[PDB]
């Protein structure tokens, strides 16, 4: 069933699983028309599909052309997501296909379940965690590849960089979600924390800075300070 604080370590066992987040699939800017009415203009989007154990991220980029001439785009976005997840699973060899797919929003359950009827042994689950994957477009290299795409495209990343060489996947996921939570609560501060100085650079093949263990502790502390703060600033405490 649903995923919550109590069955948290299941994410890091040896059963292949994917998180799927659709919050950045259908993105718009809202603007005024010459007649003073409001219109949306769609911008490129992405499906954030992530293996939390290995850090592999299958970033399916959603080009605006896929909305052309379609109605009810928020509903269609959910079914497009599921169609692209289903195509992804079918492209993987059997031994690489997930045993579970966990959706970050419950409205994806029916669209994914219908698209995966061919896969009766793949469990589609919701979660009660408030995961911050929507902030994935605050990661510069991911934002960049989504906005530069001129056609539908899949790009593969490891969102943990080389962290697993030194830390467990439980710790890597905790770091990842702290970083994304920070970026979601106050993007500017979070981004200032990560890279204002340049003696800790982002390798060309990485998404995040090459911090040492001791620098990650300081970074991680700064993000918690940020998050607790914004939370007082927000409720005045």
């Amino acid at each position: 069933g649903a995923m919550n604080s109590s069955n948290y370590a299941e994410l890091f066992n040896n059963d292949i699983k994917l998180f799927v987040d659709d919050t950045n699939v259908y993105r718009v800017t809202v603007h005024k028309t010459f007649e003073g009415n409001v219109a949306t203009k769609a911008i490129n989007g992405c499906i954030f599909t992530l293996n939390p154990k290995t850090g592999h991220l299958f970033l399916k980029i959603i080009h605006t052309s896929v909305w052309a001439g379609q109605k009810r785009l928020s509903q269609l976005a959910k079914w497009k997501t599921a169609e692209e997840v289903s195509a992804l699973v079918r492209s993987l060899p059997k031994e690489e296909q997930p045993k579970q797919i966990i959706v970050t929003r419950k409205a994806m359950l029916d669209p994914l379940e219908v698209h995966m009827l061919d896969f009766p042994n793949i469990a589609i689950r919701p979660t009660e965690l408030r995961l911050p994957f929507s902030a994935a477009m605050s990661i510069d290299k991911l934002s960049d590849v989504v906005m530069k795409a001129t056609e539908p495209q899949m790009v593969l990343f490891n969102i943990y960089d080389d962290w697993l060489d030194r830390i467990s996947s439980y710790t890597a996921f905790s770091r990842l979600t702290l970083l994304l939570r920070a970026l979601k609560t106050n993007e500017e501060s979070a981004k200032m924390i990560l890279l204002s100085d340049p003696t800790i650079t982002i390798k060309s093949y990485h998404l995040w800075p090459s911090f040492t263990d001791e620098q990650w502790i300081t970074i991680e502390s700064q993000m918690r300070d940020l998050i607790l703060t914004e939370y007082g600033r927000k409720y005045n405490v």
């Binding site: 269609l76 079914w79 599921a82 169609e83 029916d110 669209p111 219908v114 698209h115 009827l117 061919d118």
Partner: protein, 300 residues
């Protein structure tokens, strides 16, 4: 007009005959029911005074043979059986009709309720849903489960309703996943009507029989089946106009007849609100919406 005679009434029991019912006391001189209208299926059902658990009963059509009821003290229930010696039947029934030991099927002349509840229900189709082929009548009770329920456990004693599942390969064409889940016309018209039921009269018949088993026996799986078959139509954008008008009439009389005190368990809030207010057919069920809003506004 036909007759179901009873050997005797050895245990106190509430007898129902279609939408009617009467109390019979322990060892009361009761010998059956007469003046039953020919041309319709009927159901004769029972609730023991001692054990309200297990309502049970028998769907039958008097054109298909001479039927009587006989208490079985081993199995403890009133059993429908067939008298194959037609002269013994006429003689026994005439003996009791002369002694005035029978209740008269009490149809009011203005009253088309039973016709309206059973318009499309045929015995031959009931016998395929309730498989017991040595008998011309069909036994149903509260506890019997459906074929679909046994997939989610005695196959002989099941209700073999047509399986409907909105999240199934049968319901959803590859490549039309979104289209077919939000608009079930493909599944209603090609798969069910054209493929399985052959016509809407068979579809309606199964839906009316599902409702009647839910109402008379509190059979949960039957209610599930009723609701499913409504929802499939209501959730199709493309439904023949004659089916919509007929459905509205069907539902109207089902809602009219439902006991007011059983609405909380026999009516599915979600299905009904969806059908009447959200679905493609939200504006096509005028008579059904009007009686539902005036009788069960609480559910909506």
């Amino acid at each position: 007009m036909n007759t179901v005679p009873f050997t005797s009434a050895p245990i106190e029991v509430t007898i129902g005959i279609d939408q009617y019912s009467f109390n019979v006391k322990e060892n009361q001189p009761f010998h059956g029911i007469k003046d039953i209208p020919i041309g319709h299926v009927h159901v004769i059902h029972f609730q023991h005074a001692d054990n309200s658990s297990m309502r049970y009963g028998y769907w039958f059509d008097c054109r298909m043979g001479n039927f009587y009821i006989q208490y079985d003290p081993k199995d403890g229930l009133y059993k429908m059986m067939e008298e194959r010696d037609g002269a013994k039947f006429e003689n026994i029934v005439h003996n009791f009709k002369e002694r005035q030991m029978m209740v008269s099927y009490p149809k009011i002349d203005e009253d088309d309720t039973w016709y309206n509840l059973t318009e499309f229900v045929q015995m031959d189709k009931i016998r395929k849903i309730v498989r017991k082929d040595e008998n011309q009548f069909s036994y149903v009770d509260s506890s019997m489960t459906t074929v679909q329920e046994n997939e989610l456990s005695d196959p002989a004693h099941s209700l073999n309703y047509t399986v409907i599942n909105f999240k199934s390969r049968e319901a959803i064409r590859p490549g039309h996943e979104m289209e077919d889940f939000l608009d079930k016309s493909y599944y209603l018209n090609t798969v069910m009507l054209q493929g399985i039921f052959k016509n809407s009269s068979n579809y309606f018949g199964e839906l009316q029989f599902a409702f009647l088993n839910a109402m008379f026996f509190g059979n949960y799986g039957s209610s599930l089946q009723w609701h499913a078959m409504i929802e499939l139509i209501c959730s199709s954008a493309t439904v023949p106009k004659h089916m919509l008008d007929k459905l509205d009439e069907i539902l109207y009389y089902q809602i009219k007849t439902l006991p007011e005190q059983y609405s909380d368990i026999l009516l599915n809030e979600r299905v009904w609100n969806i059908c009447l207010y959200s679905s493609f057919q939200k504006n096509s069920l005028h008579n059904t919406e009007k009686i539902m809003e005036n009788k069960y506004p609480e559910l909506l």
